Design a protein around this nucleic acid. Structure first.
Lengths: 128, 88, 135, 166, 70, 74, 120
RNA sequence: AGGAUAAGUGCAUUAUGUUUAUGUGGUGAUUUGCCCUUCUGUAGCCA
RNA sequence: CUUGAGUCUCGUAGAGGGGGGUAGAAUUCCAGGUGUAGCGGUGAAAUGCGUAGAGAUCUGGAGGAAUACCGGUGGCGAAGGCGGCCCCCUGGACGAAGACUGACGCUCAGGUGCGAAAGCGUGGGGAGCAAACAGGAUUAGAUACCCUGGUAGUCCACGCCGUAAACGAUGUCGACUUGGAGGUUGUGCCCUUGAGGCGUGGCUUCCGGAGCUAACGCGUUAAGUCGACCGCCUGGGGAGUAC
């Protein structure tokens, strides 16, 4: 479910507020909570929560990553939150469910997906 | 493509000076005039093949209408081919 | 004879260049067998993305007619111009250099989406109070 | 279903009979096949290949497939006089315009098929599939009109309605 | 994907089942494979094509009742 | 009574509204969802005319900074 | 016998309900759509219908019995109204296509029905 | 995005997913036709 | 002569070609700031990368192919061919009025001309992906499968025999033969006022009647009725190679 993190209760930069970022891929989600003017206040992942395989991208693996970072960032003491989502990777709602159980008010799901303007040709990999 | 003002020189000078465009002497003169616009383009790079297909239509037909013209009236034929420097 | 509904926008610090450039385009058009249908300056506007930084730019819709020869001379100038950040210019096939359903949306741009400056005195000179000056 | 010429009383000219199989557990084939050409002993259209659970049904299938459930091009009287080529379902029979009645020669069982078919009067070579299960089509592809009667005034037959229509 | 505006002041969901602009709608039909220039037009762009089967499905339900094959 | 042929403001609802143009944000925006972006033809219910031209006009516009092209502006 | 022409107009004035698509092989008797609904030419069907209704009259002295076929889940009530007798026979809802050549079976199931209908 | 008025509403790994080892060749019970109904199953009309 | 064909301005659509212009986003990268251990890969995985502070993330710059979406049974080209969008040059099509010539026609050995792709001569470019080569993983083995690094390549410009699955797997063009409708476009008539109906063309496509096919299927853009002229075939293996 979890691995080592910052505290729930002490003091560090004492910022009162942040923005959160969910980087969702086909295999992992990276959830990194940041300062509202642009400096990281903590991170987790679904693989650093103890999931592997296809299972690393399921909504319940996206959840436990999000609840892992969301704990840690109370040492910097957030009280209100806004969120960015950036990817087509699964469980884009389950990570929000965890941030609201950490006590946060969720203030817009601002889509800034990392899709290019087509970009580069993709890997050969498989035959269909 | 052929301007109205290039068409107006050509109409006034060759065939009848009131809107004759279809007579064989003047029809040659029009095709020639669009060749000249196309030879201005082909001073750029020389992969201009999708227009060259179209040049070959205009040339061949011009040449068909000169074969028709030498079977008819000989003055129109020797004037036309010599005054526009055609068949090259 | 051909119609080109040319619309463009210009960077704020450079907007001083446009009142002069348009008046050199109008005298080359009316001097040789085309028309200025309307020439509308739109004022300073909010972009939908900052270009070359800064989230505002100043828009002019020229509403040009010119022959094939003339339009060839204005367009090589306009394409290598430096004041324009970007432009889009349309074809003779169903062209609309006269009367549009953007009549409301122009008035709005000058009225509500502008930023009032010295460059923007120049914005009113850009298509209504024309003086010959720059390129 | 499919309509044919006149006859009175019929001859079941069975020219060939065979047996099929693909026997296995549950759904299977184990039936018989039979081939018959139906006619009146001078000239009629009708050709049927059919199959069933045993020899009695096999033949009754085949006699039904001649008389119905089959596309044919028609004949009139037990004699031919519109000798022309043709194709029906790949099978090609060619007949060049020549004498009626006499000259009849065709190998194997085919001289007997031609007597019930009505085209033993004018006939020429076959091409396409050369098997006796499919080349019996003589009175079909080899006759591209719906009547070919024995009076030579046949070519004035449609004429007499056309010039009265004038 | 979630798309930039869909719900009135978020709750514990994100409501991604609901709205979309045009985020990949002609360019992706097969994963783990290379891209092409002319192939996408018939290989990948089946959006109209899959609407023929949605139309047939609302059609075939009535016709099964009239035939009484329901 | 009256008729008009091959011109603006009659047939369909109007032929002077999304003829071909791109310089107006509003004609494009009748056909744009709240995320600032183009949606399918079923969604928009544009006349056939208005769509074969709207395919060029939404790109023209995006490119002239009338619409927000990209996802950092959506 | 103007009487056939009254009924054709009296029926025909529903002006269709189906889209402006029609069977190509019917094209002669079809008038142009009004706002995407098919409309038959009403006048062009009135000469056909009078020829048909006299031919039906001539067979009345030949007649054995009539069989109304083409019945289905929407056409049955319209056949119910047509027959007004048991000199003319019909079904209500559906019809099994073909009876004419496998009559052998069909008469054998009629005998099974009436035996077991009398026991019931 | 003019406007986020969460408006202009119509979908979520952007649905087209699938390493999962292989094993020579041909043959074989619904029958010798030493073949049950053709019977209105053809414009006449029949078993 | 027009009944065949050819031509001028007007009106209309499009990714045809060649050269110009132009915006923004991921990967990739550098910098500064913040911040802590996995990231990645997959059916599970190791190889790879990372504590020299990776991954993610804020701000700003970089750099080069590509250009999503509207996008579709769509549209353009001579078949293959062509995809952001526009201009400049210019080809080709599609409508319609005024006006013009009057078989100037059809087909096409010979023929010159012309590339999907890679290959390729020399030049620019290489962010991502990737043959090989390395090493994992797969398994009766693993060159195939599936993965990671990674170089040439992919990407442009002109050039060389235009190669092929060079397409409707269907020669050309043209006359003739029941249509209906979608997509989508000139235009005559209607309250243009319903992407609408009717008059008449247009490409592109579904459906199906006479007819055509062995079967699927084709059917007004034929695979029907034909017409002229050309290209080409005559069982397989061996061989599309040899000479």
């Amino acid at each position: 479910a979890k691995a080592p993190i910052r505290a729930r209760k002490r003091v560090r930069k004492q910022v009162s507020d942040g923005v959160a970022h969910i980087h969702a891929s086909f295999n992992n989600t990276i959830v990194t909570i940041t300062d509202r003017q642009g400096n990281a206040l903590g991170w987790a992942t679904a693989g650093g929560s103890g999931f592997r395989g296809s299972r690393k991208s399921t909504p319940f693996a996206a959840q436990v990553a999000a609840e892992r970072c969301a704990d840690a960032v109370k040492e910097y003491g957030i009280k209100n939150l806004e969120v960015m989502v950036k990817g087509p990777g699964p469980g884009r709602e389950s990570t929000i469910r965890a941030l609201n159980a950490a006590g946060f008010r969720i203030t817009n799901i601002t889509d800034v997906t990392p899709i290019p303007h087509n970009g580069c040709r993709p890997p050969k990999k498989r035959r269909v | 493509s052929l301007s109205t003002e290039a068409t107006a020189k050509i109409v006034s000078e060759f065939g009848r000076d009131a809107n004759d465009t279809g007579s064989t002497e003047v029809q040659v003169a029009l095709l020639t005039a669009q060749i000249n616009h196309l030879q201005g383009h082909f001073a750029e790079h020389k992969k201009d093949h999708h227009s060259r297909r179209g040049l070959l239509r205009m040339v061949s037909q011009r040449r068909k209408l000169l074969d028709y013209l030498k079977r008819k009236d000989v003055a129109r034929y020797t004037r036309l081919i010599e005054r526009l420097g055609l068949r090259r | 004879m051909r119609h080109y509904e040319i619309v463009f926008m210009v960077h704020p610090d450079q907007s001083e260049q446009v009142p002069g450039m348009i008046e050199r385009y109008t005298a080359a058009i009316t001097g040789a067998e085309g028309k200025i249908h309307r020439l509308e300056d739109w004022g300073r506007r909010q972009l939908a993305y900052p270009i070359n930084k800064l989230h505002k730019a100043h828009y002019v819709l020229m509403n040009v007619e010119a022959p094939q020869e003339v339009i060839d001379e204005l367009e090589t100038t306009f394409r290598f111009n430096d004041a324009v950040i970007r432009s889009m210019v349309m074809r003779t096939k169903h062209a609309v250099t006269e009367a549009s359903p953007m009549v409301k949306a122009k008035d709005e741009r000058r009225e509500r989406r502008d930023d009032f400056a010295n460059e923007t005195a120049d914005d009113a000179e850009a298509g209504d109070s024309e003086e010959e000056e720059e390129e | 279903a499919h309509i044919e010429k006149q006859a009175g009383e019929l001859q079941e000219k069975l020219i060939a009979v065979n047996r099929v199989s693909k026997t296995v557990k549950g759904g299977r084939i184990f039936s018989f096949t039979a081939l018959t050409v139906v006619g009146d002993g001078n000239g009629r259209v009708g050709f049927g290949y059919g199959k069933a659970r045993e020899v009695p049904a096999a033949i009754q299938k085949a006699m039904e497939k001649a008389r119905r459930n089959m596309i044919n091009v028609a004949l009139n009287n037990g004699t031919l006089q519109h000798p022309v080529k043709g194709v029906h379902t790949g099978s090609r029979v060619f007949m060049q315009p020549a004498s009626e009645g006499t000259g009849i020669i065709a190998g194997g069982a085919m001289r007997a098929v031609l007597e019930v078919a009505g085209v033993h009067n004018v006939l020429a070579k076959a091409y396409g599939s050369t098997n006796p299960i499919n080349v019996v089509r003589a009175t079909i592809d080899g006759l591209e009109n719906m009547n070919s009667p024995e009076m030579v005034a046949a070519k004035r037959g449609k004429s007499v309605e056309e010039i009265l229509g004038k | 994907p979630v798309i930039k505006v869909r719900e009135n002041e978020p709750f514990d969901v994100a409501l991604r089942r609901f709205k979309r602009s045009c985020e990949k709608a002609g360019v992706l039909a097969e994963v783990r494979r290379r891209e092409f220039y002319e192939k996408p037009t018939t290989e990948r762009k089946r959006a109209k094509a899959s609407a023929v089967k949605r139309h047939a499905k609302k059609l075939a339900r009535e016709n099964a009742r009239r035939t009484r094959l329901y | 009574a009256r008729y008009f042929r091959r011109r603006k403001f009659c047939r369909f609802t109007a032929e002077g509204v999304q003829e071909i143009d791109y310089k107006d944000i509003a004609t494009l925006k009748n056909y744009i969802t709240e995320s600032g972006k183009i949606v399918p033809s079923r969604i928009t219910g544009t006349r056939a005319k208005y769509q074969r031209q709207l395919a060029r006009a939404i790109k023209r516009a995006r490119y002239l900074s009338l619409l927000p092209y990209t996802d950092r502006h959506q | 016998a103007t009487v056939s022409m009254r009924d054709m107009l009296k029926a025909g004035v529903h002006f269709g309900h189906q889209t402006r698509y029609w069977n190509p092989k019917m094209k002669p008797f079809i008038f142009g759509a009004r706002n995407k609904v098919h409309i038959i030419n009403l006048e062009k069907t009135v000469p056909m219908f009078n020829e048909a209704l006299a031919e039906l009259n001539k067979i009345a002295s030949r007649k054995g019995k009539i069989l109304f076929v083409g019945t289905k889940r929407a056409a049955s009530e319209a056949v119910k109204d047509a027959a007004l007798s048991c000199d003319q026979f019909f079904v209500n809802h559906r019809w099994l296509g073909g009876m004419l050549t496998n009559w052998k079976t069909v008469r054998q199931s009629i005998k099974r029905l009436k035996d077991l209908e009398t026991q019931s």
